[PDB]
Design a protein around this ligand. Structure first.
Ligand code: LPP
Ligand code: LPP
Lengths: 385, 385
């Protein structure tokens, strides 16, 4: 409660924004002359205010567009069907009851398709609207009056929500994508250092946050776009896809870190006295990889290009020294007597797996540097200080 | 569309069940004497029918319980606050508008806690109810009448939905958990065989479905409990947790299969002519592991206990033969000349990683056999034919 509020002041702002919107809708109704027939309609503005308020501006705009297309296609089919109904004559109710069944079936069967498993709220409004216009007395006169007053209150509530959401401390989805990329870059370096230290000591969240985030990145990329230019992002079409391309290169790099974490929780392990022969070479690769990932995170955060020197020279030298050391002392992993116990041989062969996985991790960083160059080129980053 | 319907006949049943419930709520309103004031309330039964209908019986019961606790705590605070309001006197509206803000803030701030990120629908109903009872004329007389008629229509819609959901082709969540475990057991064996074949040939969905399913398993475990005894599950407290314990042992086994799939997409690879020396030993382990996983899946599906013989004898013999073969020909992975090129040495050392990962996969199956014995003991499985 208090802890999350002090750590996260955005949540308190969002909650006081919704409180203010509700108190404004309330004020605009408490100051009208007391009427019995006005209080009954008031519930629709409260429902609109409590349904259309989202966390981001792009989310609010996209969901409002979808809900308006739903409500209008529903009112359209309804008005394009009650006319066919009138033609039937006496057997009018049977036609309506037989059309509500088919609309319910199609609107419940088209919401269950794996490709259409996000926009359930454009289908629910369609069904609710179509059903409400055939069992409410379309042929009376009080119908149109009630419909008009309800739509008026709904439009008032949506206008209030949209103004109190767009003009007071707006939250943008592009800043959330921008910050998420930097956080993942930091976490992968922390996990790599923790893994090397744990293996050499006589991590889950780091690689897990990276591996399990593509859905969030694509959702935030789907909303950023609605939003208009603001602050550092001033072009109309901002290359938001290059951020997902760099996050994918980093996930490919983080899978080897997940396999090095898995090497520490295995049933077959190597003798401790034999792991202390390669400690220096193993620790150098970790130090250099963490330094490189942290410098790439700092360059992404500041929106700066890469300088003249090469960023992969020390890590390559470290991995070549590691390979030389392994070649010098490779008689500790195999048994030369048998050249022509199972547990002992597997425990000796277990160290080579850790070393090979570290070398594969160092070989997978060139694609991440290439994706960073592509993003720094398409987004018009500034020349380094 | 048609393809998914022919493959999945359950979706068509669910959609025709919702269509039937809507057509029944419609019939019970079209046959009452034409009234202008009755048609206006009809929308609430349609809304209830379209909101309370879930895919499973346990989900419907749990969500109905939560929505009823919400609505009653809201109406309770409202009636326990409007009285304090009356005491204020002239400055009555100010008190109401000042209480709606604090309720909106607390109900928007308590829905954002990571532990409370499932029951947003017990908070939305609370807010909607509390707000609707303070800006609707609590001190008039028409208020109680409208409230009573609206609650009557809501209860009618919920009763119809619950009867047309529980008495026509009910879907149970325990059969979905039961079937999901068997599907994951089949998929892991398919992935293992595909991985060994791809590596030896001159898979994603299998291990991915297992790795990414704990959330589904725990959701299905959270509803299968509200459901009453039926069919093969006749005890009141059915051990549904042992199914999740066996799924977790299988996920631990599937992580090595994900690392063997990752070994095929690496930048450093071994010469093809050197991979053909261990083909037979490598293929035997795969055949035996797939046979064991398929026999465990068949025993879980039929609800049968294990027989007298040991199920891990052939796989253990295969892995010991593999280790012997590797020991006989280990001069192909290292360089003895240097005993005291980087790419060549890494490519030679890459085969040992595949072999060590296969041996770790074979060493991780005893815990899965132990978890299966525990489930076959707590669930009172039958003695093998
Ligand atoms: C380019 C312009 C874009 C338009 C901008 C305005 C944005 C409007 C988006 C919100 C509109 C949907 C309402 C959402 C709130 C809500 O109450 O929606 C609440 C629920 C949805 O609930 P959930 O989505 O939470 O499950 O649906 C409804 O009850 C609304 C359906 C109508 C209610 C009965 C009134 C009949 C309609 C009267 C008007 C006639 C329309 C048809 C004429 C042909
Ligand atoms: C042993 C107890 C078991 C009881 C089982 C009964 C299950 C019924 C649960 C349904 C209740 C929630 C409604 C769901 C449908 C819906 O319309 O709910 C629709 C929306 C919820 O929308 P979403 O959840 O989809 O976002 O919320 C509402 O509009 C409901 C608010 C109540 C309706 C306004 C009128 C006030 C209520 C009048 C009665 C006063 C009650 C308080 C008296 C103290």
């Amino acid at each position: 409660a208090w802890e999350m509020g002090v750590s996260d002041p955005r949540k308190i702002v969002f909650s006081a924004k919704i409180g203010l919107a509700l108190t404004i809708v309330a004020l605009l109704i408490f100051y009208q002359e007391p009427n019995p027939d006005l209080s009954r309609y008031s519930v629709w503005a409260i429902l609109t205010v409590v349904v259309v308020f989202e966390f981001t501006i792009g989310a609010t705009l996209s969901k409002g567009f979808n809900r308006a297309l739903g409500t209008l296609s529903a009112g359209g089919l309804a008005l394009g069907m009650a006319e066919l109904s009138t033609l039937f004559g006496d057997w009018e109710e049977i036609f309506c009851t037989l059309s509500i069944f088919c609309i319910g079936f199609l609107a419940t069967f088209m919401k269950l398709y794996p490709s259409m498993k996000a926009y359930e709220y454009g289908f629910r409004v369609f069904l609710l609207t179509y059903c409400y216009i055939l069992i409410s007395g379309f042929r009376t006169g009080q119908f149109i009056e009630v419909a008009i007053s309800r739509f008026l209150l709904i439009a008032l509530g949506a206008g209030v929500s949209l103004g109190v959401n767009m003009f007071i401390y707006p939250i943008w989805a592009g800043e959330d994508l921008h910050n998420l990329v930097v956080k993942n870059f930091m976490n992968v370096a922390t996990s790599l250092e923790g893994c090397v230290n744990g293996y050499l000591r006589c991590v889950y969240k780091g690689y897990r946050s990276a591996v399990e985030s593509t859905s969030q990145e694509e959702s935030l990329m789907s909303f950023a776009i609605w939003e208009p230019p603001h602050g550092p992002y001033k072009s109309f079409n901002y290359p938001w896809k290059n951020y997902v391309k760099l996050s994918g290169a980093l996930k490919h790099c983080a899978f080897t870190v997940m396999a090095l974490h898995g090497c520490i929780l295995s049933e077959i392990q190597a003798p401790e006295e034999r792991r202390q022969v390669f400690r220096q070479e193993l620790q150098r690769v970790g130090v250099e990889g963490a330094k490189l990932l942290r410098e790439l995170g700092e360059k992404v955060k500041k929106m700066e290009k890469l300088g003249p020197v090469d960023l992969l020279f020390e890590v390559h030298l470290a991995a070549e020294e590691l390979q030389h050391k392994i070649d010098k002392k490779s008689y500790l992993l195999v048994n030369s007597e048998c050249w022509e116990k199972t547990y002992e041989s597997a425990s000796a062969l277990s160290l080579a797996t850790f070393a090979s996985l570290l070398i594969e991790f160092v070989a997978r960083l060139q694609n991440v540097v290439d994706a960073f160059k592509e993003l720094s080129q398409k987004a018009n980053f500034k020349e380094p200080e």
